[PDB]
């Protein structure tokens, strides 16, 4: 006692995402063990509702869960500005945390840190290997030049060449390889300065990026059904080996790894995207994005829970142990390599190392309704709707209208 009941949402509701879960519902058990009389409420909603409709809906009414699951930047400011955030500096000080995540900055607003990343990210290309092969390709491509002859060998033998689910809701896994574009076009500045009123949707080099993500549908290179496809459905299409690469996150290295439905788990490398010659070159997309924030609106019973769960969850044993099984990676410092460590995940690791350095994404540069206004517009792109000209003009005309907000 005191009886306290807290809400947890989260977004591990997928197949592919249960050993999340178990872990985060150990760390709960553990937690409700510590702190009698306090339970917790999981409350599992899928990743795109979660964010864009269900928390965004209950800050606005100020009510957030008590933890939730959070994204960096954009989001963590405006929920932050509108006071729904905890700060947690002393809580980490007093928790011995206070230097252990590799980078805070997306969660930080004014010094005040509002939430604890769980994981990092990179986005890059995952490929089959044997498919490759199959179309000649030896090498993962380094260069644009080298990357479009590998799609054209690939559609010669009529190997789907890129596995994207882009569909109902699904709109930002386009934006992924949109964004990757369009900073490898226009350079990382570029996305820095929309929201500034520095850079442009309609910079010509941005305009280039769309220009070439709209020319990889034409070719076929994109999956042809990419709009009848959700995120997952995509990520299945290639890790059943049924399309030769695949754009996406580090956090999907489970399901390409997975023993009982990945046909690739022993035929799959990892490439950054390629470099198109300027300032995009050489970088990689990632960083530490996600994670769980806490509300503000906490009496002490329920602050007492929360401190003992981010005790909980954020330990090395835990991340090593998110690592180790699901290939997850660490947003805490210290972890040792796995003992049996995952050659796609050292992969991914040289693409990241070698890399220049990395850039955020888009979404945690660019206010809410310009993500989701981008996502309508890459769907509508690939479908035919919207040339590349018409998709930037209308992009900077809700860019204008938010930055006047
Ligand atoms: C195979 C599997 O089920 N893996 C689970 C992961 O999906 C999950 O990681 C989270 O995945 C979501 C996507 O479903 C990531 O969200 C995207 O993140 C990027 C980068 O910040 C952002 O640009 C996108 O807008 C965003 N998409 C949406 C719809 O929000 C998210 O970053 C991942 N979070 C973490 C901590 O890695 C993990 C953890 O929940 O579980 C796996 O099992």
Redesign the pocket.
Known sequence: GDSVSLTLR???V????????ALLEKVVKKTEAEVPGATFKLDGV???V???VKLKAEMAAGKPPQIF?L???ADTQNYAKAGHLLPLNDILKELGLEDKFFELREFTVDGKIYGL?????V?GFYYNTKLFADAGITSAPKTWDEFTKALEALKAKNITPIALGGGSG?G??I??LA?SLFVATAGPEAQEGFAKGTTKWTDPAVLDGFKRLKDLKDKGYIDPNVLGLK??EG?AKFYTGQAAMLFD????????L?KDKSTVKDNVGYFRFPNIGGKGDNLI?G?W???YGFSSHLNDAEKKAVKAFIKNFYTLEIQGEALGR?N??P?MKGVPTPAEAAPLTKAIGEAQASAKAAF?????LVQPKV?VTLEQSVQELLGGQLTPEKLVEKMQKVQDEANAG
Do not use: C
């Open positions: 989260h977004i591990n997928r197949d592919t995402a249960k050993n999340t879960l899928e990743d795109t979660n964010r864009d699951n994204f960096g930047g990343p769980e994981a990092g990210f986005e699904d930002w896994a934006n992924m964004n995120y997952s990520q996150g580090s956090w999907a290295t489970s399901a390409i997975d997309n960083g994005s996600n994670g699901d997850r990676v947003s955020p994404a888009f979404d945690a993500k």
